[PDB]
Design a protein around this ligand. Structure first.
Ligand SMILES: O[C@@H]1[C@@H](O)[C@H](O[C@@H]2CO[C@H](F)[C@H](O)[C@H]2O)OC[C@H]1O
Ligand SMILES: [Cl-]
Ligand SMILES: [Cl-]
Ligand SMILES: [Zn+2]
Ligand SMILES: [Zn+2]
Ligand SMILES: [Zn+2]
Ligand SMILES: [Zn+2]
Length: 374
């Protein structure tokens, strides 16, 4: 409701306790944020689950072979443990933010550039062993503190085919299998293993993702659930389809986690307003309408969803700003009509507003939509 006031989120009724019997409520954080007093209060008050926005990624963990950097990751694990929060590990395997040393042969050449089958099969086994060693060191350190793991991120392509990353080119599908088997082997039967991707609703990828996980489970590959990043917009995808997607995977026995939730003010591509003060109040009512529908569907499907995690804490920090391109006509007036004329774009220079918390840490229309029981 829009009559409900813009009160401080440190005073608002606690978001995790409202959903505590349906799924955990998480946020993606950066280690600098555990040094900001307002973010610490936000995390303490409102969330019971946590994930590293960045520092647990392949390049953050092992930038050179043998150089393991856990100081940052540790800082998050410590803080969650201190405040009884669940941890997700994002992510063990990815085609972005992954050091290039993974994919070089013994003479340091791009393993992809090899033509020899003999040298190709060699590079594959080397890549798989580098992977098992990467997963191994991480999992051994964190197995008793990090329950939920994004083993692989974003491996199915949007074209319905497996993403042709160096992983896929060099090692074929087996890099995926080696990934989940490594995590299970060193972390044991108590950590949960997920495959994590975006557009898990959009076809052909959705059923591509469905086929891949089904075949892998049929092959004994240990994968416990699906992660839906859920970088969505106010109107799309439909709650209908979201439900069809969560229903599909739950049918195979897989858990579902909303892993990177943010509701964008914009479309695709974004035509973003240049500042926060520049977004009209009505967009905040559209967004709250969606969050209400969205979180009602999450609650109906609570027995199929174990966690819901936003890709940030409050509107003052969201990676969505990097996609917030601002469009300027010839007279230099901002253009936000998706088809209107324009002359220049300033990429990543704009502001988005995706969370239920505004950049001054006061509750948005969206917070009230999901905190009530209507
Ligand atoms: O800070 C940025 C970070 O927020 C971003 O994280 C990805 C966002 O899209 C998905 F949810 C991925 O799994 C995340 O890893 O990546 C770029 C980084 O600079
Ligand atoms: Cl970011
Ligand atoms: Cl504000
Ligand atoms: Zn709490
Ligand atoms: Zn960030
Ligand atoms: Zn405000
Ligand atoms: Zn509601």
């Amino acid at each position: 409701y829009a009559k409900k006031p813009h009160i401080s989120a440190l005073n608002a009724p606690q978001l995790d306790q409202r959903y505590k019997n349906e799924f955990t409520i998480g946020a993606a954080v950066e280690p600098y944020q555990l040094q900001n007093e307002k973010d610490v209060q936000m995390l303490k008050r409102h969330f019971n689950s946590i994930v590293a926005e960045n520092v647990m990624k392949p390049i953050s963990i092992q930038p050179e072979e043998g150089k393991f950097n856990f100081e940052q990751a540790d800082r998050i694990v410590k803080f969650a443990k201190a405040n009884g929060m669940d941890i997700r590990f994002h992510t063990l395997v990815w085609h972005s933010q992954v050091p290039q040393w993974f994919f070089l042969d013994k003479e340091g050449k791009p393993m992809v550039n090899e033509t020899d089958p003999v040298k190709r099969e060699q590079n594959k086994q080397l890549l798989l062993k580098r992977l098992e060693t990467h997963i191994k060191t991480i999992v051994e350190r964190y197995k008793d503190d990090i329950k939920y793991w994004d083993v692989v991120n974003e491996v199915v392509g949007d074209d319905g085919k497996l993403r042709n990353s160096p992983w896929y080119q060099i090692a074929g599908i087996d890099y995926i299998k080696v990934a989940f088997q490594a995590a299970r082997k060193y972390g044991g039967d108590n950590i949960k293993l997920y495959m994590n991707d975006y557009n898990t609703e959009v076809e052909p990828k959705r059923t591509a993702l469905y086929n891949l996980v089904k075949q892998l489970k049929e092959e004994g590959v240990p994968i416990d659930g699906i992660g839906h990043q859920s970088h969505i917009a106010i109107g799309a995808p439909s709650e209908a389809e979201i439900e069809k997607t969560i229903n599909m995977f739950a049918a195979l026995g897989l858990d579902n986690q909303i892993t990177g939730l943010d509701v964008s003010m914009y479309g695709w591509p974004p035509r973003a307003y240049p500042t926060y003060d520049a977004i009209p109040k009505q967009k905040f009512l559209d967004q709250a309408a969606r969050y209400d529908r969205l979180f009602k569907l999450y609650e109906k499907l609570s027995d199929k969803i174990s966690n819901v995690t936003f890709w940030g804490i409050a509107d003052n920090h969201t990676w969505l700003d990097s996609r917030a391109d601002v469009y300027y006509d010839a007279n230099g007036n901002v253009v936000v009509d998706p088809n209107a004329p324009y002359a220049k774009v300033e990429k990543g220079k704009g502001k988005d507003a995706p969370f239920v918390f505004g950049p001054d840490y006061k509750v948005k229309p969206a917070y009230w939509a999901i905190i009530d029981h209507k």
